Amino acid sequence: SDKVVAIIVTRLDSLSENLAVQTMLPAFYEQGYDPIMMESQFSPQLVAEHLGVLKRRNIDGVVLFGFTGITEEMLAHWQSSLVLLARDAKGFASVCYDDEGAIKILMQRLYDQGHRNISYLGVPHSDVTTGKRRHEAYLAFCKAHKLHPVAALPGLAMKQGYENVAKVITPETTALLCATDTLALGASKYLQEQRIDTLQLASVGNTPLMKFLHPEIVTVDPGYAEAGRQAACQLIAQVTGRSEPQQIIIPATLS
Amino acid sequence: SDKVVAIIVTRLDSLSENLAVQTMLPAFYEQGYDPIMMESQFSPQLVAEHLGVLKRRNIDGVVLFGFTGITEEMLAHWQSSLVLLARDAKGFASVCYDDEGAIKILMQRLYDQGHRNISYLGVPHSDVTTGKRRHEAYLAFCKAHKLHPVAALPGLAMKQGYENVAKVITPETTALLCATDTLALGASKYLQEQRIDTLQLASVGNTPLMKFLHPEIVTVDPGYAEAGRQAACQLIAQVTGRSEPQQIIIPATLS
Numbered sequence: 066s067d068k069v070v071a072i073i074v075t076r077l078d079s080l081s082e083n084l085a086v087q088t089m090l091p092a093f094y095e096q097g098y099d100p101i102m103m104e105s106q107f108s109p110q111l112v113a114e115h116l117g118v119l120k121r122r123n124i125d126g127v128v129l130f131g132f133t134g135i136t137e138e139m140l141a142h143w144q145s146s147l148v149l150l151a152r153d154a155k156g157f158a159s160v161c162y163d164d165e166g167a168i169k170i171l172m173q174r175l176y177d178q179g180h181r182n183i184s185y186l187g188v189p190h191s192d193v194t195t196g197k198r199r200h201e202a203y204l205a206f207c208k209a210h211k212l213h214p215v216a217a218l219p220g221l222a223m224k225q226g227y228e229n230v231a232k233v234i235t236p237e238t239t240a241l242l243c244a245t246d247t248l249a250l251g252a253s254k255y256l257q258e259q260r261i262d263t264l265q266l267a268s269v270g271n272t273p274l275m276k277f278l279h280p281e282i283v284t285v286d287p288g289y290a291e292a293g294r295q296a297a298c299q300l301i302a303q304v305t306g307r308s309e310p311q312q313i314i315i316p317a318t319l320s
Numbered sequence: 321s322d323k324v325v326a327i328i329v330t331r332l333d334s335l336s337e338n339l340a341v342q343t344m345l346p347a348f349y350e351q352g353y354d355p356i357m358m359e360s361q362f363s364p365q366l367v368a369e370h371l372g373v374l375k376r377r378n379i380d381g382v383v384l385f386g387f388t389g390i391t392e393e394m395l396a397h398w399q400s401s402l403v404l405l406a407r408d409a410k411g412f413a414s415v416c417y418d419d420e421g422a423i424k425i426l427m428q429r430l431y432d433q434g435h436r437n438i439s440y441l442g443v444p445h446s447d448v449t450t451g452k453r454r455h456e457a458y459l460a461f462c463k464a465h466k467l468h469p470v471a472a473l474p475g476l477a478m479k480q481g482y483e484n485v486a487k488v489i490t491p492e493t494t495a496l497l498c499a500t501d502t503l504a505l506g507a508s509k510y511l512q513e514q515r516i517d518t519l520q521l522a523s524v525g526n527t528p529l530m531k532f533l534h535p536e537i538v539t540v541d542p543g544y545a546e547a548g549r550q551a552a553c554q555l556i557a558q559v560t561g562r563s564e565p566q567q568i569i570i571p572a573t574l575s
């Protein structure tokens with residue numbers, strides 16, 4: 066009888082995900098739904114378990130933070146009462162980010178500032194959005210502006226950024242684009258230690274931690290706050306029959 | 321029919337709370353319970369709502385992160401299937417930290433290192449544990465060792481640490497004890513800006529973010545990881561009838 070929605074994040078300690086969750090919560094409370102959280106840790110098996118538990122407890126709707134391994138078949142019992150965040154699936158409502166647009170905007174900014182030797186610190190191509198799309202957008206920009214690409218794809222963790230930044234720092238390098246704020250935080254620790262002050266850093270996130278600690282890093286906002294509001298509203302709209310599933314892309318903005 | 325436990329944190333973006341949650345999750349999965357999270361944001365009214373929703377959905381047990389405003393009367397329908405974390409209540413199972421012990425250990429280390437002018441950056445006395453107990457432990461140490469106390473109690477936020485650190489720095493000040501890692505992170509940003517390198521910082525938390533960014537800060541571990549394991553085990557023990565409610569205090573440890 067109580068209206069309940071579930072939010073399935075991949076990581077409870079992810080700042081990027083928490084920023085989207087922060088705007089979902091007031092929108093759900095205003096709609097009369099009490100929100101509950103669950104964590105997947107990128108496991109499709111754990112997601113399949115959560116979904117069954119939620120179904121048997123008659124939960125009204127689900128906001129699922131998508132990742133590689135989620136199949137349409139495991140989302141079958143939730144077609145009309147589920148919204149995917151960060152990934153899309155045919156016949157499902159989704160709220161996605163503009164990864165290519167985020168990288169092109171950042172690369173243009175660095176290029177207009179005079180930077181020609183810009184290195185990249187990213188995540189492996191198995192991670193479709195943060196990894197593949199972001200890295201390929203960097204490559205497409207380098208190709209179009211006859212720049213020499215220098216990249217390393219260690220992964221998501223701050224410590225991975227710290228351990229692999231030296232690999233992409235060359236004598237001619239003046240700027241470093243990090244696929245995530247977390248990676249920029251790790252890379253920044255190494256540069257501070259080695260007393261490298263000459264490098265302009267750039268990252269995707271615009272998280273409050275990044276803004277506070279490194280005001281000098283150029284950041285691009287993927288729109289986590291907006292994504293959260295949209296996902297909550299799309300979910301309530303379809304569970305109340307006011308809307309059919311839509312696929313929304315949040316535009317990236319600079320500063 | 322599915323076994324479910326709820327974890328009610330105050331803030332989803334609190335690193336200190338997430339460290340306790342991190343060790344609760346594997347212990348619940350091993351016991352056969354699927355964990356769900358809710359957020360209170362220090363509102364007793366919101367807690368009263370969550371508890372009712374959980375009761376009507378027949379949730380097996382609750383781990384509640386305590387704060388000022390929670391009464392025994394609102395916990396009445398959960399006496400045997402609830403564990404409090406960070407605060408105690410008569411007749412309730414609880415897992416608490418040693419706030420006084422954490423401050424005494426840190427002050428002794430700073431004192432043994434030769435520091436005599438130690439300033440304090442804390443949180444107001446209305447926050448019983450982080451605020452009152454931590455600040456009073458600092459005062460008791462200063463009294464016992466004939467030291468001059470210099471303190472400011474702005475609150476929990478990183479920005480509050482940054483804005484109020486200047487107030488407690490005197491020309492004789494050699495060390496600064498921060499009630500939380502978050503406060504030390506904020507104070508550290510100000511000191512970096514003002515090019516103050518002479519100060520020895522100390523904080524309570526030993527969070528991975530602090531350890532990675534500031535290896536030079538002296539930290540005390542309140543035992544969030546241990547607290548999480550204990551709370552999960554005390555909860556499953558009482559819901560299965562293996563145990564009666566206990567009040568556990570986790571010892572603080574240095575490094």
Ligand SMILES: O=P(O)(O)OC[C@H]1O[C@H](O[C@H]2O[C@H](CO)[C@@H](O)[C@H](O)[C@H]2O)[C@H](O)[C@@H](O)[C@@H]1O
Nearest residue numbers: 075079080081130131132151192194195245247
């Ligand atoms: O370091 P954090 O703050 O966690 O940011 C990293 C990254 O996090 C998210 O991407 C990851 O999770 C999503 C699901 O939420 C997956 O679909 C991706 O494959 C993961 O990479 C954000 O979407 C990213 O913008 C952010 O940079």
Ligand SMILES: O=P(O)(O)OC[C@H]1O[C@H](O[C@H]2O[C@H](CO)[C@@H](O)[C@H](O)[C@H]2O)[C@H](O)[C@@H](O)[C@@H]1O
Nearest residue numbers: 330334335336385386387406447449450500502
């Ligand atoms: O800045 P964070 O990492 O959140 O640490 C601050 C502080 O957080 C917790 O205290 C607060 O929440 C508890 C309930 O979880 C309340 O009982 C306190 O009154 C609040 O101050 C931790 O218990 C503290 O150790 C930590 O420093």
